[PDB]
């Protein structure tokens, strides 16, 4: 059994009294709902309020979300209830506290009295000429325009970041990682940090654009998109590696599918169309995160159909990740909990088997491990598709789950 929970949204830093402090009162509900891991925001000093422009990595007290004591307290609370903590690791780029003699912000400060992470432009990818001094290696991946991109091929860089990551585990209690903007460096580099820090899991955010048509809708065939994702996992170490990826393929298809196009939910081989259908053990599914949803809303799930999104990922192969707002703010708390309960009770895991029973525009029906049947869609009556022995146990707007 494994169910993730993103424990913050894009407005969290703003929480009166501190975000971690407020999360303490949510721990028991999260644990009781069957969550096994909670993904927490980037914990260090950041030039940006949300934490995605990290500077003094060791300076946890400067975080807008709360300080080290407050963070350790939350992680300890989660651990007391048997839930693990995943930290949002932002290492593609970094902001330097000080300017060099060129007036460029490229002299770093790790946040400790000694020289840990006190880098210079020599650690900035040479091709990021907005900040580099031309001496470093070429960036192993994509660039982040608003800040210096780090040269992960630099030995001191690899050594000091691994040192830092191990301190997050030993000093704050983090168990695992969420690799922010993993397209920014190669899978080979991600392997260095993953293999060198032994996380219970390392879920990478590898976000590639999805193929779409002239009408704006994603193509039915998204094999190229999930292929990129499995190729990343292969390169990071495959089955032996703790690394895995967010299933953006499933997110994109699902966004469009629920709009009366549920025939999109099966590929020509009879399998789920996203990463879930090719390497479920490595696919972390989700309805929305702080980027696609929340106040950023870069690619929100159709608002009136969110529970169909959860009826899908919570009963299916892959590792589902519940979004904070959906659980505590949309009034779906009991319904989501019931779905997680059905998943756990029937022993459904990331590798459970999926047998699709119906895949028409307004009706998708699937059977998992021969023990659960789920339906989503605007077509009310699918009773002729339900196998004998199955009784309904959860249901709401345009979705229903049976157990037999
Ligand atoms: C203040 C910056 O705001 C913008 O960048 C944001 C971005 O819009 C957010 O979506 C967020 O992106 C992160 C995702 O949330 C996360 O899931 C993913 O894993 O990682 C990305 C980051 O790679 O956060 C970023 C960074 O805060 C905007 O695009 C950016 O230009 C802007 N930076 C400006 C402000 C500065 C402040 O000192 C300058 O240093 C920058 O040069 C300037 O452009
Ligand atoms: C048990 C059913 O659960 C789901 O149906 C929802 C439906 O989508 C909602 O729109 C809502 O409809 C009710 C209206 O709110 C109400 O005003 C109206 O008077 O009555 C309707 C009917 O209840 O609520 C229902 C219930 O949550 C799901 O989408 C739907 O497919 C499902 N029906 C299945 C259950 C059965 C038992 O094995 C069979 O009776 C059906 O054939 C089967 O499809
Ligand atoms: C479990 C494997 O997942 C990945 O493999 C997928 C391929 O990348 C993808 O191209 C392939 O496409 C085929 C489809 O299966 C068919 O539906 C289609 O009709 O024909 C396509 C022809 O290629 O689908 C693969 C998934 O079925 C990884 O690339 C691969 O390395 C993975 N195997 C790993 C992991 C396990 C399972 O834990 C080990 O037992 C394997 O030995 C190891 O190699
Ligand atoms: Ca220092
Ligand atoms: Ca850059
Ligand atoms: Ca980069």
Swiss-Prot record:
This is Alpha-amylase type A isozyme. GO terms for cellular component: extracellular region. Ca(2+) 2 binds at residues 109, 112, 114, 118. Its cofactor is Ca(2+). It is an enzyme of class 3 (hydrolase). Optimum pH is 5.5 with p-nitrophenyl maltoheptaoside or amylopectin as substrate. The gene is AMY1.1. Disulfide bonds: none annotated. Ca(2+) 1 binds at residues 92, 139, 142, 149, 184. InterPro entries: A-amylase_bs_C, A-amylase_pln, Alpha_amylase, Glyco_hydro_13_cat_dom, Glyco_hydro_b, Glycoside_hydrolase_SF. The active site is at residues 180, 205. Binds 3 Ca(2+) ions per subunit. Keywords: Calcium, Carbohydrate metabolism, Germination, Glycosidase, Hydrolase, Metal-binding, Secreted, Signal.
